[PDB]
Symmetry: C2
Subunit: 145 residues, 2 copies
């Protein structure tokens, strides 16, 4: 019979699958740039085509998560409706600019890595801008205009 | 070029890479819902912010590689193109030999046969990926 995914090992395996598939697409597109520079177009093309595979895998994991009423792997927020999706976006961006990247920057400065700290501070300011743009979308959706 | 091995900053770059990787995937997935419902401005914003998260993820990988750290996904070096392909092979190999078969068996045990069939499809897919990368690596070393 049909069962709730909530609290199951399968729910956790969909989450972990999503994380790994997300990383695989980013990794393969980064590796493709090195193949591009070095003159390996067949290798770059394969990396890019396999990366599209990993997009399909990630999106299918999110399909089962959303259809199963499970939460966003990144934020533990529901992602059933577009409004919920934007609220998930806002929650993650808010965590990143208010807590995560400032904390990473402080640790980098304290460990003697000022260039890395500056990068984390650039990202904190970027995620704040993202949060603001998503907040404006949510106003448009929630207000129905 | 400063060595990051054994630091909390090394761990933070890894976690930042994971988060940025997920953000790009999430925002492109959300854009498809905006597409279906007729919100092209919202879809376009999601796609443009997703490009931001690509830039963030790649910059984390630059610091990882320049700081003597390993690939977040595989714990393998990714300095050279050959090392990058060997990292791809290692992660594909883990997924087809172990990770997705294991997920499929658990899904069938827990009574999720449709999810199990999906995991079985993915195990076969990652095996094909591993083989295609192996054919590349042989060409590079040759
Ligand atoms: Cl080539
Ligand atoms: Cl719109
Ligand atoms: Mn995959
Ligand atoms: Mn962001
Ligand atoms: Mn980001
Ligand atoms: Mn793969």
């Amino acid at each position: 019979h049909m069962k709730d995914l909530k609290g199951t090992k399968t729910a956790e395996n969909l989450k972990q699958g999503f994380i790994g598939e997300s990383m695989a697409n980013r990794r393969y597109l980064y590796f493709a740039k090195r193949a591009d520079e070095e003159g390996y177009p067949e290798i770059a093309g394969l990396l890019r085509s396999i990366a599209e595979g990993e997009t399909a895998h990630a999106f299918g994991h999110l399909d089962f998560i959303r259809q199963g009423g499970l939460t966003d792997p990144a934020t533990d927020k529901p992602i059933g409706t577009l409004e919920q999706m934007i609220e998930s976006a806002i929650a993650g961006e808010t965590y990143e600019w208010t807590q995560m990247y400032p904390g990473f920057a402080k640790v980098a400065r304290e460990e003697g890595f000022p260039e890395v700290a500056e990068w984390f501070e650039t990202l904190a300011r970027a995620e704040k801008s993202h949060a603001e743009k998503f907040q404006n979308v949510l106003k448009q959706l929630k207000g129905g205009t």
